[model samples]
Target: ETKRQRYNKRLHALKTERSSWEGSWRDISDHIQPWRSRFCMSDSNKGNRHNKALVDDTPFKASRTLASGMMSGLTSPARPWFKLAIDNPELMESAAVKQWLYLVTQRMQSVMSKSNLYNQLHQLYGELGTFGTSCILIVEDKEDVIRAIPMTVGTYYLATSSRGMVDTIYREMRKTVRQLVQEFGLKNCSNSVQTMYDNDNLEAWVEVVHLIEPNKPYRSVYYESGCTEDKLLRESGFDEFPGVAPRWEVLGDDVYGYGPGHAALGPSRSLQVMQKKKAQAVEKQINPPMNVPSSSKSKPFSLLPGSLNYYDAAMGGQQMAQPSQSVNLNLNSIMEDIVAHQTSIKETFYADLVVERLDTEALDPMIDRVFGIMMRGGHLPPPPEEIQGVDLNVQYISVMAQAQKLVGIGAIERITSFVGNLAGADPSALDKLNIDQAIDQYSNSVSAPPDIIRTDDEVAEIRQARAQQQQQAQAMEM
Candidate 1:
């Protein structure tokens, strides 16, 4: 508490940072000391604000909620100085770097506090090199919402207090299964559940059922069998369970979380209830609600909010429907469809090629033609860049083949057209339209493509540069 001691403490903090990578426990201890400061104090007498923000025993749910809500509400127009200098190294060293690093630190803290129950689990996983895995699981569900499920291998088993761990893994597994299904489009080899069981050795199986996007709700069916266990699940708030059957059934093996008895039973019920509540949420849709009145009471009978349309009957039995002339496909669906088709076209063309040429020049024209054919017929769009194959950033041969398909179909061209159509303007004239409407069209895909020249050499160069940069950054930070 003396003046010299206080100055020495500040000096010690800086010195610890400078000596951070010397294999010094003192520096590591000093670095994380902030988190434990108030935990060090007496339980009842701790400073509430400091303890809440920096050193609380409880999860920082309230802090995270307020922070996220603030981010969602606050909107500042871009300053004139906010020029985007693509790949600008200077910006990386300037305020951009500090802002990004701060945001990353905040994200990591949020992830830990949400999915992780304690800091010790996080430290153990960090030592075991599982931090990367944690981040992927967290970000897969919500890009801005950070969460981490600490995992560590013991001689016998891993230990953790977090409940979100299961959710993290479940989502990750679902994503992997979804991609494989998307690629193969449901083998349809057999439907008999008996043919699919593991005999107690089954680890995983692939099936083609319509899985609604994770962030959205899609109905599932659970059949009610006469068996006691079956009756239990049916009454246990699981409506979409579709019920249990003989163990030998192939279809039965396709399901993981749901069956006679599973630990996920409760979470599954919780998810369904959550879905029901979400269904009742106020949507930001463009269509006028049924209660809204139109200016022209007698202008057109078909234009009324509740008018029945001809196509409604064709879709199924008669139901109220929107006028086809005014119906615009949701932006998300259009983007996904175009991109998916683009990939298919390119793959078909590339596979049929028997040429030995490796360069784009010999390859581009054929791909472009095939892509055009698919697009004209309404089949394909560019493949997503950040797809996980064996693991994140570990591209398999199949992924390369996919990326190659994009090259062949002139994926860049398809993207340009898809986006232009979405915005209702040419790329060069994009400034003339309503920017919000234009952006809504582009939001069909959640992520934008990386800005790099679309060529083999350019890709190779970017990959090499990224690897080098990552190595250097890690060396500096660690």
Candidate 2:
């Protein structure tokens, strides 16, 4: 084949491969764009970064209100907090390690704050409910090790292994040649599509990132064609792989593992339709058209406050004397229906996760009292200590935490009731309840922050000492 034929064949092939991705993007974008509007957030629909208003002309902006409420509920109360727990005491006690962890923590927080991680998370949480799935990109920053940026849903393609781990990512970005060169340091990008479009000369390109073996170096390569001999724009490798490909996180709301976002279209559409109907009902109630005699006036009539127009009775006096019809609307029922849907939307978003009146100070005293009561005849509570194991666990302080707390509190209450009954039967039976274990279980159930709770080993040591003292006292009585 001639060079010209090869080039045309390559272009055709590239377009053919991209067609599949474009089809998926088109379908999903159609589903998510309406929800994006209600949220008043910019999305990757049509590969553009722009925002449109929610266009709420009704008195009740139910969708926007519910979204905002959900976002705040998930983000405001409990922020992401981390602690380093190493299994080896030597590593855990090392001053160098401690300092390193401290600096790492500071840097993470700095990056998150600067990148508006909370705000992005708020947007993600809203989108997860509205779009069914949201994407977040963790990119390294110059100052901080990493920062997170949310990706527009339809602008990217993702694939995962059967084991449910992200294996490849394809992100489409629109940028000027200058931007491409500056961001990726692609030497050939400036020459490839210098003036892509007629007007602004914006170029569209796809970035492909794939996961290789852990021992292999992390590399990024740019491709401009789909043939066997595609044009390679650049190739570079980073010092570390971070053991993850693409560094993109997908979050689904109440979905199966790696599932699409579930609640995006259903309630939002219902709310929109209901609000429009309600607006029409209100418009009719305010001004329903009246029937006037054709001979009296050919123009529409307006009942302005305190304005009277004398009409000649010569035309048709009796015909014009018809009573003005009154519209009796049951506004109460309509309002109730709106409220019911609003409540459901809020529930779907888990808006009630963080109790508005939750006072940590109040909870502190209640917790202490409960512990004291449980330990009245047993060991005193252990002194707080640092966690000393590499078995790190991350706890999310979202609506799910509140549900866990409820289940945990109920379990504790039942156990306490049972123990109380045993104590009533025999005063010393309280000792058998193991107050230390009870408190530990309660703390875990309540999703208590690590800073406030003692470690398992410390509590066990305290309980052991208490048991020794009780045994000695029994020996003296004998």
Candidate 3:
């Protein structure tokens, strides 16, 4: 049976037989210790409501009330103003509040995603981003790196623009999706495949689009085809053409294709407009030089390219033939200024590097070591200077304590998740843990080096004591 079917069947059976399965008070009472520890008060009279009135406390009513209060408001009698903040449903439902929550969620997701994607990419490029004080690190041969660079630059440059960016992103995403689909034989999957997987993919792509939208210039990938190098971006599973051009193309191409090959397939009439505007702008500049007289040594270049006859042989057989308008703008200066602006535009318009500053190894060893030590000692070690970065005083023990309070009193799952995440060997691994896993991991194993015996006699004595305690307990039970 499917997992859902199995679950439903088990649930139905349990419900149908519940009257018979109703647990004995004696058997249920066996959980008294655990339930008390997990959800009861420090005071006694944990399960016996009959004796509750006789106890020193009135059956933990006030404690329970406070816990309930915190659940509703994350507040207690100790800090009533916190209730005001939490109780504001307008604030709870506000876009800004939701956006902030999503921001944190995305950042944490990014941290994990960066680690994971890098791990996959690192399979190709070993231990990436670790060459200190140098921009380039030669892991692969210089030739491979060099050859790969044109493709990288093409994608980075062209794909960063609105038209380019979306194409590149869609290409990568589609490649990954298709690979997964192929690997799992899920090629024709519709909604029935797996809602959880679909949700995950949707969520990740949504984040990618949101993050990458600003850099995307064109609505889609058509403008990106100009990048000759991105043919690799296409061949290497980057290109994803929707195959429909804008409606303007149909009319414009048919009318314009017969002439100078300047149709939708070639350069469009829009570019003709741009060329005219550029020429006119240069003419205007030449007509009115900004500061310098027509005789002055320094003259602002015209926005338009001037007469072809005036253009030198150095300009590759081009001659400026237009009237000597003597515009303030020099063609060379205009071209230089345009080039500079385009360069800046290129720099600003692409994707920012989306990886973390921490070395992957550092996270593995540092987090692993901290958790390893904490599981052994039940406390984190003192922070070293380098490790004493942000929030150093709030040690793992303190975070765990806060987490426990939230779980124990407030019964907040998010808080519990946070604590579990903090204590987990890898934050990415937090989702996989269960009660059985925790028990198997922690109950029987010693996480640290056993304390040194220190002396031969003490070692012997400890073993002797263990044997004696076992013997006494067994004898008493018998």
- The residue ranges of model 1 lying beyond 4 angstroms of the native Cα positions read 1-93, 117-139, 142-478
lDDT of 1 at 356: 18
As for model 2, its CA RMSD to the true structure in angstroms is 12.4
Highest-lDDT candidate: 2
Error of 1 at 432 (Å): 53
- What candidate 3 gets wrong by more than 4 Å, as runs, is 1-182, 185-328, 332-336, 339-478
Q: 1 or 2: which has the higher TM-score?
A: 2
Off by over 4 Å in 2: 1-80, 93-100, 111-119, 143-147, 194-218, 225-229, 237-261, 294-329, 354-478
lDDT by residue (68-176, candidate 1, tens digit) is 3322222111111011111434433333332432343333334334533234223322321111111111111233232323322110011111321111011101112
lDDT agreement with native, every candidate: 0.27, 0.45, 0.27
lDDT by residue for model 3 (288-331), tens: 43332232222345434571223233444323224444545446
C-alpha-based local distance difference test score of model 1: 0.27
User: Where does candidate 2 have its weakest 10-residue lDDT segment?
Assistant: 357-366
Q: Compute the lDDT of residue 212 as modeled in candidate 1.
A: 12
Question: Pairing residues by index, what is the TM-score of model 3?
Answer: 0.16
Give the C-alpha miss distance for residue 11 in model 1, angstroms.
52
